[PDB]
Write a protein that binds this DNA or RNA. Sequence first.
RNA 1: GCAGUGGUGGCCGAGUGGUUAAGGCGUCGGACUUGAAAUCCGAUUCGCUCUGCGAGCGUGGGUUCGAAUCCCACCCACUGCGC
Lengths: 239, 453, 315
Amino acid sequence: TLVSDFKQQKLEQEAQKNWDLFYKRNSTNFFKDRHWTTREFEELRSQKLTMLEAGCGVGNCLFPLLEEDPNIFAYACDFSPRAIEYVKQNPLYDTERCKVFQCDLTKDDLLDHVPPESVDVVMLIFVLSAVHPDKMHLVLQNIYKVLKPGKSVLFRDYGLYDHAMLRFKASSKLGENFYVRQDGTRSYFFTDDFLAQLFMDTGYEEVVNEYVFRETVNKKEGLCVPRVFLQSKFLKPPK
Amino acid sequence: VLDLDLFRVDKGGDPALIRETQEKRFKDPGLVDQLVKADSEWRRCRFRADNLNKLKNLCSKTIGEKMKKKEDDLTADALANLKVSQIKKVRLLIDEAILKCDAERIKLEAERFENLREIGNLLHPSVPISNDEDVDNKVERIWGDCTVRKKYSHVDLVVMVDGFEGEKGAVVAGSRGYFLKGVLVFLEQALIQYALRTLGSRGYIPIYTPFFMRKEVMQEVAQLSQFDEELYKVIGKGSDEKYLIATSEQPIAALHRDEWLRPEDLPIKYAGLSTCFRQEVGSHGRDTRGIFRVHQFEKIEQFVYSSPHDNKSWEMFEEMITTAEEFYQSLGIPYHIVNIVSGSLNHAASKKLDLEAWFPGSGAFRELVSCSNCTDYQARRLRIRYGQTKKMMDKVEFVHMLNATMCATTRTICAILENYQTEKGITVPEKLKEFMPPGLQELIPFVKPAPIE
Amino acid sequence: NKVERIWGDCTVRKKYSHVDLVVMVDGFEGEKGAVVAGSRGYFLKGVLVFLEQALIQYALRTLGSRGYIPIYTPFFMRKEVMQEVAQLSQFDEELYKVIGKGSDEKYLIATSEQPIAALHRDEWLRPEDLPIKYAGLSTCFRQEVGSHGRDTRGIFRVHQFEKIEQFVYSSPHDNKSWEMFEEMITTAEEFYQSLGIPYHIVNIVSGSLNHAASKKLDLEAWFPGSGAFRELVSCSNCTDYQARRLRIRYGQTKKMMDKVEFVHMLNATMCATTRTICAILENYQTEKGITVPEKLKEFMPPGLQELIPFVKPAP
RNA sequence: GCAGUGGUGGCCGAGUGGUUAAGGCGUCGGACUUGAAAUCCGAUUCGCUCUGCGAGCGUGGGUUCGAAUCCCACCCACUGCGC
Ligand SMILES: Nc1ncnc2c1ncn2[C@@H]1O[C@H](CSCC[C@H](N)C(=O)O)[C@@H](O)[C@H]1O
Ligand SMILES: [Mg+2]
Ligand SMILES: [Mg+2]
Ligand SMILES: [Mg+2]
């Protein structure tokens, strides 16, 4: 049935290694820059807005919004050293606007690099699906302490019944809505209820949490397919 | 052989399960423990040999660089501070260490392998756990009337039709040699035509195999005991490593040897046709003589390479036994199906079914068909991979290989003779009348008296 | 070599030789066969197994209608018996040796004439039953497979092949042996005329005769894709050369003060299946496949009774 | 059976004593792109204590610090012979 229970333990203990070898084999050429960020969230629109990018990758999510709006300071978090080195070697990088640092969002703590209750917006774009479902609230609590008590957290990631979930063969299933790719990285497909009751258990307040529907079409192969991402915004209670 | 990672417990393995299986087969446990210790030692020896090889490589690279620029806790920078003569002095120590480690590693490899080749395949949970074949062999199905009695046994019937020459055969070939002649050559050919046509209509590819297999290839498809005392050895001019095949399943298994088979077209079905040469012929009474147990005979075999996923090889197993059943039902021969006990399976089989035909003139059940599912035990040895592409991290998967006798001609002739005898001759089965000459399409007449009478 | 008679058109030429045709119909596996068995080993598969079986059926029925008794022989023979039917040249050069357990001395047969000859050794045959005719069916094993160009590769010269033989024990009196010799070569000729294979009959020169033969006729078929005559049938009259070595005696009673007479023995190939398949493929090739000879259609499976289709390109 | 030329990875095909076994072709998966893809990014022999190191160019050996490259044997092909 599911993947061997021994193998799932090897996947959990080698999560950082699997993401590091991904950046080794694929360099910065796999993912593409996300220019839809500023438009999608009512924040990030056009003073000194300090931001934390949890799971920054090689950029692709902060460099666009950072060359767009020129009064944003950014913290960058990633547990893979290769991704950090790629972010630093980017020609668009300057220390006066970015502060990149490695931090395993489940084991390490964010206060060792960012000041408490300082960040006004933190982004979770396709980062939480790579974390084991039983260590996600760890990440939510780790980022709960650096958020300004009126600030918020922005989240887009895979949702239930997306096509990518359906392409996976049965030999790639770790559990309910929990799969693994050929390269070792994993994918959890969230539901609105699961994410809601995962954010509520760590002290957040739901604002918007609803699915976003798209489609993928390759004209040459004439392939058009449905896609289901879950977008949301949670807010830290004022008082 | 089994997958070595089934014994590594640091991987996802479990040698306790191999111990349980080795007990259920009534073989020697503790072979598993010898294997585990030999393998755990071989892994450390391999690590050390790789490290010695790395040091030798690094010495050679440094020497080459020193030369082209016109000049064992060693490091890269450490060697970069030596004259060429000193690095060669170090290379000599590396050589000695490498040689002794290589001897130790070859010994450990041979020992681990001779322990591994004597551990049997995992058992299907349907196998009856026992060691008494006569008592616990489970009868699954019965077809026809398996209690009727008739006058003559095949040992008399082959002579009353004048189709058998035993004494002259033993003069020519020796114990058990025989000439088949007259009406029984036509009947054997009719059986071959009928079986090939049936299997071809089912989708099997008829294939006529070579009868000499080389030793290098026969080792990978045979067992120790068989390869030792059951196979004839052929010798030409020179010397001679060739062995007469004991079944067509052996060359057909080596047909896709060392290949990456596309999953599409994976259920390849082969109807092998060859002459088989078996050296063991023991007589347990009179009704096992004649042409029943002989040294040479033609056999038609089913052979299927299958996908290892989705329980497909077990559905294929049922399909193959069903094909043989329908063959013998169209021939009108009564039989029962028996599930063989754990202690009687060979090492490769996870399960084995046998079709045992009722011999009314002998009053016995005799095995005609033998259908086995050997899973990936042999494909791993022959390196017959299931996909064309190897994945990034996953290990290579192997195909399952099933085989099943369709028709051994001598034994089936004996069954037909015993079941179709009348007082005037042998009635020809309705499905074989197409393939018989005119005049031999209704009856094979008795032309000699019974040797017992 | 004296050519005695022609039949058919022995000058027409066609596109491919058998070496390409056996691959175009997908009935030959030479590389994997050489991996399994070694030089010249081969798997025969698919449509070519059905065609070989059809040839065996047709040959056996043809010979059975003529009064021959089909006989399936042992494939190895004790050395003490093989010496009396073969020569020394054959054992080293052409006979494989079979080894059992305990190190027996058996040899794989090179032709079914060898076991059939030993079927009546040390016997006194009744003159009344003497035209004793047998249609041997067996697998033959030869060591010499030396090649002489591309057109001799494929399944033409192999180590293992099925062969149907004519073997006759005859009276040694009244020129009956030579009448039977003519009858045997005529049976083979009619077999190949009914298949539509053009040939000429050749009288082999005395230099290239084996020791037993007192006369030999070969039937050499025309190969239109190869452009050559190839031997398909060999007919030989050995008179009493082997009968007295095997002590097969003509009368059942011996006269006082009068030496015994031995029978006459004649052998003739009826059909070596690989070579005959090569000849059929080369003579019946079209642009879309091989036409099935009219006489083999009843012995072929449904779907292969008019054409053997090409399914691969020519190498 | 001799007396010549040959044998590279799933396939073709480079390879020049210091490769990363090039380039293709085939196959296989991953895709998060709002500037989505009539495509992009990769993987694709074996082994080990796996971000690396080791082995592997028909198979075995030799020479060399180092061989896929040079030598030998065997095996199997092709070209000429014997048969
Ligand atoms: N538990 C964890 N702690 C910190 N980073 C993690 C993490 N789990 C996964 N990651 C990182 O999250 C990244 C997801 S790839 C997505 C990158 C980014 N969201 C973008 O839009 O480009 C990976 O690079 C991985 O290194
Ligand atoms: Mg190649
Ligand atoms: Mg390449
Ligand atoms: Mg080599």
